[PDB]
Design a protein around this ligand. Structure first.
Ligand SMILES: O=C(c1ccccc1)c1ccc2c3c(cccc13)C(=O)N(O)C2=O
Ligand SMILES: O=C(c1ccccc1)c1ccc2c3c(cccc13)C(=O)N(O)C2=O
Lengths: 115, 115, 115, 115
């Protein structure tokens, strides 16, 4: 897949399993169109969101439902979600791994982009 | 102020200066209503966004224009911006510091919430 | 002070208070010579470690006792400590802020170096 | 392997390739004994450091030579290295992934521990 999302839990030192992830693409009218969604697996990874032909140039938003993840563990976290917004494929097709490392009052996100 | 934003640059080891920050409150119709904005100071800090009276309970979005910052430095960035979305004051008024540490392909954000 | 250390807790969204910090200078024989130490304040900050005269060029180690902090909170940690090792003042005296953001299984450290 | 190290570059959004990594184990006399070493591959991963039978309980230090990585890219970074120190296998054998995300003036490190 040209787009993979990986989510880790910095409290438990584990993959963050069953985290909902929604992907949107900015349409010509500037609205966010639903693009793909899924949940992280037991390895904290979400594969198969899209294909090379569907994943054309554009601005994409990945929204990771971090609040439901923490709430299910009993925690009332700070953030409603973790959103990552980015222009994709501007210089031709690339493969993107969007990684997120989650704590109740902090998160980090990183992209690894390969050709 | 009950809300302060602080932005750091992990490439130069410095405050991130003159970074545009916009704050929104979620409206009854789920749209984002612009509320306050500013540019970070020489210390990477943005003070005076709001007041205790005005900063009522609700869902808030802080959008940090990370792409303009990296463009100003001649460095290719990944993200269009860094967004932080949170519910405020759920258990009473708090002082919020939203800190963001920026790299071209990664950012982290942390909330320091004090009483 | 030319050297300040600031520690934040990503689980509680707070300064990390009463965290032990030890600073060492590398000796001619490659051993670590203890130099200064302290505990972070209510703001997570440790000031007054050293002075401009004393803080000459050299390699310095800051060891943050993250394991004691997490043990005090009843939370199982991964690391024995967080170490930060750096060469100081290579291009002249600077003011260094060493910031660390702590989670039980992850930490980040950043230097803010100003003139 | 029960111990894997993965290193990423937050400036370029890429694996950090050919990074030297040295692992030490604390001996009964409290000294650091060399345990294993290697370099990250094209995927920024270092596999094969040890075996399940060799990787007994103990305190381990992983030193990642982040300074040589940056210097080879023309950058004079803040840190001399990134060190991660941890007790392993205290509650029986586990598999450890030590991940490090590198910027010139910042790094983060995370452990994913699985059973
Ligand atoms: O988020 C921070 C951080 C991110 C990665 C590593 C270490 C600290 C951070 C860095 C520096 C400061 C702060 C603060 C609050 C919350 C986070 C940080 C803060 O109040 N101040 O003054 C910092 O300098
Ligand atoms: O973002 C990561 C990170 C966050 C904080 C500290 C160290 C690494 C991170 C952790 C683990 C993995 C990855 C990956 C890509 C990008 C970032 C990470 C990745 O591909 N894999 O396999 C990781 O395990």
């Amino acid at each position: 897949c040209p787009l993979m999302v990986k989510v880790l839990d910095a409290v438990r030192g584990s993959p963050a399993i069953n985290v909902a992830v929604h992907v949107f693409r900015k349409a010509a009218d500037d609205t966010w169109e639903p693009f793909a969604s899924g949940k992280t697996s037991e390895s904290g990874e979400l594969h198969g969101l899209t294909t090379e032909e569907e994943f054309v140039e554009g601005i994409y938003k990945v929204e990771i439902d971090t609040k439901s993840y923490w709430k299910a563990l009993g925690i009332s976290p700070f953030h409603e979600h973790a959103e990552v917004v980015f222009t994709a494929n501007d210089s031709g097709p690339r493969r993107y791994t969007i990684a997120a490392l989650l704590s109740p009052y902090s998160y980090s996100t990183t992209a690894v982009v390969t050709n």
